Amino acid sequence: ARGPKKHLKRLAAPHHWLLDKLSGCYAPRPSAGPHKLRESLPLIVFLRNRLKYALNGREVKAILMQRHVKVDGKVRTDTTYPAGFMDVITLDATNENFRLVYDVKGRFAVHRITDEEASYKLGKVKKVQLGKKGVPYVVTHDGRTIRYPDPNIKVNDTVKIDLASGKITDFIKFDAGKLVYVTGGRNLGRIGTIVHKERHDGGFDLVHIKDSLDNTFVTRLNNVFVIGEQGKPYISLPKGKGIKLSIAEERDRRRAQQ
Amino acid sequence: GISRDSRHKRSATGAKRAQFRKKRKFELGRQPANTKIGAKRIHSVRTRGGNKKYRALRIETGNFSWASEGISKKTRIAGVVYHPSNNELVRTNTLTKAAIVQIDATPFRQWFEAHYGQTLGKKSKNAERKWAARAASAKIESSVESQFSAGRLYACISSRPGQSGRCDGYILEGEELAFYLRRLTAK
Amino acid sequence: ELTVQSERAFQKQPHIFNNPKVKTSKRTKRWYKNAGLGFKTPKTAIEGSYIDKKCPFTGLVSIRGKILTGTVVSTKMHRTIVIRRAYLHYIPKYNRYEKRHKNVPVHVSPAFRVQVGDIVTVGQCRPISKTVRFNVVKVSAA
RNA sequence: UAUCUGGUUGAUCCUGCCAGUAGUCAUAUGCUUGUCUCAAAGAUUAAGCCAUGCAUGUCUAAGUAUAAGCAAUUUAUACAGUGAAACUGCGAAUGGCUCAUUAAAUCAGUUAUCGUUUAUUUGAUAGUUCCUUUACUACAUGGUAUAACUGUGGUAAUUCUAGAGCUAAUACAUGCUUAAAAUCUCGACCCUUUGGAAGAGAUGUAUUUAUUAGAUAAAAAAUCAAUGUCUUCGGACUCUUUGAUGAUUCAUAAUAACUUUUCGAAUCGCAUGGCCUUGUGCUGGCGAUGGUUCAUUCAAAUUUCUGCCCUAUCAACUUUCGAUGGUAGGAUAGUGGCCUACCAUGGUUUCAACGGGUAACGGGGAAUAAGGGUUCGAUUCCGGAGAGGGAGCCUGAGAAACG
RNA sequence: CCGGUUGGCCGGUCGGAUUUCCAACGGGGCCUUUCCUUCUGGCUAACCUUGAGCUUGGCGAACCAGGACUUUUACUUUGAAAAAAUUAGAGUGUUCAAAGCAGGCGUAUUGCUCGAAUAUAUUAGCAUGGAAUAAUAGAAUAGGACGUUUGGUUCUAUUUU
RNA sequence: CCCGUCGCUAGUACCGAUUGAAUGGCUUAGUGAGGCCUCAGGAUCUGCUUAGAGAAGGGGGCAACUCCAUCUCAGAGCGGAGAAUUUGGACAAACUUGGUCAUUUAGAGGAACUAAAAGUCGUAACAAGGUUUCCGUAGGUGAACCUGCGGAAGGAUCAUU
RNA sequence: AUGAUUA
RNA sequence: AGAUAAGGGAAGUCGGCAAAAUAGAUCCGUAACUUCGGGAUAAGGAUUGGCUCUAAGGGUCGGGUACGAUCAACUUAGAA
RNA sequence: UAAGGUAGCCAAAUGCCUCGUCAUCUAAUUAGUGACGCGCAUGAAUGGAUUAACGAGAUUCCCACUGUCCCUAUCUACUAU
């Protein structure tokens, strides 16, 4: 439409932000950033509709502008910045550190953690190439662009980063039998320990994935996110850890605590 | 303006599409260049995304490569003598890509003399050693040697001067040289 | 496919400079590439004297995307043919199908010799012309 | 909640229609109308015409301020507080309105960009710019307006404008400032002839062209053109280096040149700190602005497969003067008859092409029902189109823009 | 033969849950002329490998990278995917209801906490287990498959010399 | 019970001289604005290079004579930006003229159809309807209709070993 | 040969 | 006997009588009606010079048991 | 009455009255055309009704064109003199 869009109505904003269909006919458009529009949680909806730390967008803008807030160790004083997947946010006041991960019900969770657990994160490599002057480099899922990594690091691997620089603390390779996390689709929030995969040369490599109740499924290799080895996650995980129990067990569950 | 789309053409079955939209800016075209020789004129044009586009006109000199030697020198241009697309470009002397032209041959000759020390047409220890080592490769073939006798050498333009502002190309050798001299001599 | 230099211009593979100075085996050079997706670049394309820059193997037209199969019905064009894509469109109300066809045109190299009725599979490449998007990669007759 | 009824006969059974019945985010109207909550609303005929008035402008600590604007510095002699107008920089291409056009066209799901542009964001990223490069030249930094304003003014009227005098910049036009090594060329000279060489020019990025590398299923022998490592010149010979892709002339590197020469900070705010060779010497922080390249993101444009109402009282359509392909070129941001030159005569069709009509924008959906389904969908969301009908074009990353 | 679902004596818990079980149901595997792709590799696997009953050495997919022949579909199962709103539907006293996605619980001064499911989604496109049904080509004037063989033609090609 | 002509009233559509009329779309040809692109144009402003003199000023042979700045004016080139105007091209609005396609519409008159409480002329059909009806084809006549040739039973016969 | 309308 | 006339255009006249206009060639386009053969040069429009070029169209002699040499016509198309 | 003009056609080159009546063409039309028909006196090989093509045939209108005309003027050759 004659140029880029700038506005966003409600009901075109995604579902998993859980924004209400009343309260004004406009929605927060994620300004461009290190994550996409849809698989991203803006800081306005974060502070205003996950924590209730503010009540009005002016107040959230007040907080972000007076710099009580900081994501990835930087203030980031824009009201509609995409706080995407896996990312870290640090609040000096209350000394909290939120981590942005998924839950099995298909929503952006709120993962409370400490300052040292904030100082490292995880990032799936999105691709690898050779930059100018013969400098091999890679680029992750959070717009982070990193130079001179290990030659062992190839595509679909994961890296653990220092957050004071963009350099690497260490890496994790891709192979059969590694703990993962899913990000995209019906499987949003699962945690499922690779059993095998399949190639289909020409497009759409698929991966067989199962969580610890033996329960399996299949997902696209660009929707998965590998988090380490079986047993230990490399980070802390939210309540449930990606299981997707039945509807009836959860009804009975709620009827047990009431 | 000149469009570049297919909403003004017919479909493949034979149906005049209807007029549905107005012409756009992301479907435009522009006039040809009709690039000539002498008194270098390079207008630049603003394009989609800034990204300037030096529309050559009247271009007098250009770059030319000799690929068996890998060298590349600046040279004048006598004129075009063959163009596969149109003899009109040949006659009217308009430089484009794939264009068979004649060049001065003086930098290649003098470079050959300075590099190998071997005469055409018709002392120090270091230069003598250099030429003695580089021998057994001054034996290219008859057609290029004859053209160096004449002082007018056949080159193929491989640039797109209306898109780049550079008439650049390479000398013909061997097979396509023979092909183009056959095409030229057809009478 | 009788004569490689049929056209007025000089047909060749761009950038493939056969250097007269070096004297190596196989006097004239020819680039090629395996198209991918489990296809094979035939020995007729390797040994070929032709050029055909619009060919997927020796040329420059990457195959990527959809893949289709059909039977050839036209050959009356120059390095281009037309096939017929017989399929069955379903009607829920009447709960049963009906034959339909789509005559996709495709491009063909001299590397293949195709007569009518020869079932063939092809590949999505970039727009070769107003009508064409596909290029033939395997034939299934003789 | 899978329902029937009245009417042809003197009467009977049937076919068959009429009428009844129930509903509608289906409209109009009538008669009546006390309350809470929620809420459509000049679409249908005229995408017919419009008075008047609004609907997009915008600053910080931080681009430019002697407002001959306003408070008071008294921490400030250049201002350094606040601050209209104006230059500059962004945005004005989003939103909002309508549904006239349009029947493989838009559109919906689904592919590709190994075929392209992309402001802004987000992550990285310019020791190499003095070209007889030693006086050729300020680098504790260089040149020019011009607005606003002063006053002279001109038209009946206009968001009309001229003449004369200033002055500003992140506005224009220019412009140097930090190592060390390493290869090519020449090449003085010794001349050696196993051949060694002083001294001199280049190398960053970007554009354009050409070339080379960009790889690698397995193990031993005979030699040479000249030993190549070090020598018992019996030959031990290992050591050797290139990433991704389903797949590339991919990323990327290096040779040889092109360029009228791109970028490589003459910008701005706070706090003002340390070494002493005790100085306007040298270093030093947190930021804002902009900038060449790459990736990312918001996009954009083309694009694969499938699907659209009624019509044969529309059966052949397309190609003059592009229709189908090929070659070459121009143009494009890019592929491509998108356009041109030449050549081959192709391409679509009863599996409904092509032509006509449409009270046709499409879809997600809405009414109605046991099931199957029929009808509607301008209308809140997604994608299109348009600004009275058409055509053209400037600015910009992005318009064929109509505030 | 194996193991999963359904119940079933004994209830060995005071309407939940257990063993050998009489029974059914589909699943996984071996053999009966039933190769239902194997070469390089490393796991050598189930290891004939056995040290006294917790030991050194069986046939590579049961883990993988690559080659390879992979004759075709229609159908059907399962999954990925179908933007929200809408429809059906979980929970919720809008005081009921249309609605909406909220709310609830404290020592009510520090505060704590479950939600915002799930389903449908025509055709078409992708992977997927099946092999009934419908066609579909294969070997007949044999240019027919395995061939350790034995030649000749051909090019490619690593290790050394 | 029922048929048709003819007569009166009203409606609906058709044919029809009028090279009918208007409205809209597509369009050959001719003229062709306007921007854009290319060949020039050159008002105008502006930087550099000398360029000699009307003659002040000072410094030096202090006597003629010399050095440079100055208000002044030609004259010459070396350039930068540069509008009006201009050639050619592609985009192509609009007008004129024809053609064609559709949508309504006028019309002397001609020939139909339908509706009308009680019009005229007959009596064709329903009984063997008083010449059995009907089907096709052809001719005839005020009108129904009659007649010829073949056909049917929906006939007035299921029937003559 | 024909027996007007309505019941 | 031959010609030309501004503006108008058959108003002249029994009547467009006389005169004008049209005119070759190439390309485009072509109605009703019809005995299906025609109407048809229907109607109606465009182009045409000079010069310099370019493209196609041929004849005959030549090959161990694809191509060359040589000779001469105007036909048509296209561009500056 | 021998039998009473059938089909068809028309103010037609046949229609007196007659410049028939209606429509159209026109500003105006005894003209042209299309219709009506008790047709003085239409009519079937004394051939009726059409009819493409053809015509130095008769008639009407329209486009172009023009000294035919408004309204005449000028020029040339041959005469006249």
Curated annotation (Swiss-Prot), chain A:
GO molecular function: RNA binding; rRNA binding; structural constituent of ribosome
GO biological process, one term: translation
Phosphothreonine PTM sites in chain numbering: T114
Modified residues (Phosphoserine): S31, S246
TM spans (from-to): none
Keywords tagged on the record: Cytoplasm, Isopeptide bond, Phosphoprotein, Ribonucleoprotein, Ribosomal protein, RNA-binding, rRNA-binding, Ubl conjugation
Main location: cytoplasm
Gene3D superfamilies documented for this protein: 2.30.30.30, 2.40.50.740, RNA-binding S4 domain (3.10.290.10)
Cross-link Glycyl lysine isopeptide (Lys-Gly) (interchain with G-Cter in ubiquitin): residue positions: K61, K133, K160, K167, K173, K178, K210, K232
Domain of life of the organism encoding this protein: Eukaryota
S4 RNA-binding domain sequence ranges: 41-104
CC annotations in GO: 90S preribosome; cytoplasm; cytosol; cytosolic small ribosomal subunit
Compartmental location: Cytoplasm
PROSITE patterns: RIBOSOMAL_S4E, S4
Note, other: Present with 573 molecules/cell in log phase SD medium. There are 2 genes for eS4 in yeast.
Protein purpose: Component of the ribosome, a large ribonucleoprotein complex responsible for the synthesis of proteins in the cell. The small ribosomal subunit (SSU) binds messenger RNAs (mRNAs) and translates the encoded message by selecting cognate aminoacyl-transfer RNA (tRNA) molecules. The large subunit (LSU) contains the ribosomal catalytic site termed the peptidyl transferase center (PTC), which catalyzes the formation of peptide bonds, thereby polymerizing the amino acids delivered by tRNAs into a polypeptide chain.
Assembly and oligomerization: Component of the small ribosomal subunit (SSU). Mature yeast ribosomes consist of a small (40S) and a large (60S) subunit. The 40S small subunit contains 1 molecule of ribosomal RNA (18S rRNA) and 33 different proteins (encoded by 57 genes). The large 60S subunit contains 3 rRNA molecules (25S, 5.8S and 5S rRNA) and 46 different proteins (encoded by 81 genes).
Family: Belongs to the eukaryotic ribosomal protein eS4 family.
Protein name: Small ribosomal subunit protein eS4A
Species whose genome carries this gene: Saccharomyces cerevisiae (strain ATCC 204508 / S288c) (Baker's yeast)
Gene it is expressed from: RPS4A
Curated annotation (Swiss-Prot), chain B:
Annotated compartments: Cytoplasm
Keywords: Cytoplasm, Phosphoprotein, Ribonucleoprotein, Ribosomal protein
Ranges annotated as spanning the membrane: none
A Gene Ontology term for the protein's cellular component: cytosol
Keyword Phosphoprotein attached: yes
Residues with Phosphoserine modification: S65, S68, S72, S85, S142, S143, S146, S149
CDD domains registered for this protein in UniProt: Ribosomal_S8e_like
Function in brief: Component of the ribosome, a large ribonucleoprotein complex responsible for the synthesis of proteins in the cell. The small ribosomal subunit (SSU) binds messenger RNAs (mRNAs) and translates the encoded message by selecting cognate aminoacyl-transfer RNA (tRNA) molecules. The large subunit (LSU) contains the ribosomal catalytic site termed the peptidyl transferase center (PTC), which catalyzes the formation of peptide bonds, thereby polymerizing the amino acids delivered by tRNAs into a polypeptide chain.
Subunit structure: Component of the small ribosomal subunit (SSU). Mature yeast ribosomes consist of a small (40S) and a large (60S) subunit. The 40S small subunit contains 1 molecule of ribosomal RNA (18S rRNA) and 33 different proteins (encoded by 57 genes). The large 60S subunit contains 3 rRNA molecules (25S, 5.8S and 5S rRNA) and 46 different proteins (encoded by 81 genes).
Protein known as: Small ribosomal subunit protein eS8A
Lineage of origin: Eukaryota, Fungi, Dikarya, Ascomycota, Saccharomycotina
GN (gene name): RPS8A
Swiss-Prot record, chain C:
Gene Ontology annotations for the cellular component aspect, listed alphabetically: 90S preribosome; cytosol; cytosolic small ribosomal subunit
Keywords from the named record: Acetylation, Cytoplasm, Isopeptide bond, Ribonucleoprotein, Ribosomal protein, RNA-binding, rRNA-binding, Ubl conjugation
Domain of life where this protein originates: Eukaryota
Major subcellular site: cytoplasm
Glycyl lysine isopeptide (Lys-Gly) (interchain with G-Cter in ubiquitin) crosslink residues: K12, K43, K53, K54, K76, K93, K102, K130, K138
Changes after translation: N-terminally acetylated by acetyltransferase NatA.
UniProt keyword annotation of Ribosomal protein present: yes
GO biological process: maturation of SSU-rRNA from tricistronic rRNA transcript (SSU-rRNA, 5.8S rRNA, LSU-rRNA); ribosomal small subunit assembly; translation
Compartments where located: Cytoplasm
Molecular function (Gene Ontology), one example: structural constituent of ribosome
Keyword Transmembrane: no
Family according to the record: Belongs to the universal ribosomal protein uS17 family.
Record's subunit section: Component of the small ribosomal subunit (SSU). Mature yeast ribosomes consist of a small (40S) and a large (60S) subunit. The 40S small subunit contains 1 molecule of ribosomal RNA (18S rRNA) and 33 different proteins (encoded by 57 genes). The large 60S subunit contains 3 rRNA molecules (25S, 5.8S and 5S rRNA) and 46 different proteins (encoded by 81 genes).
UniProt-listed NCBIfam families: PRK08572.1, uS17_arch
Additional detail: There are 2 genes for uS17 in yeast.
Biological role: Component of the ribosome, a large ribonucleoprotein complex responsible for the synthesis of proteins in the cell. The small ribosomal subunit (SSU) binds messenger RNAs (mRNAs) and translates the encoded message by selecting cognate aminoacyl-transfer RNA (tRNA) molecules. The large subunit (LSU) contains the ribosomal catalytic site termed the peptidyl transferase center (PTC), which catalyzes the formation of peptide bonds, thereby polymerizing the amino acids delivered by tRNAs into a polypeptide chain.
Official protein name in the record: Small ribosomal subunit protein uS17A
Organism in which the protein naturally occurs: Saccharomyces cerevisiae (strain ATCC 204508 / S288c) (Baker's yeast)
Species lineage: Eukaryota, Fungi, Dikarya, Ascomycota, Saccharomycotina
Gene that encodes the chain: RPS11A
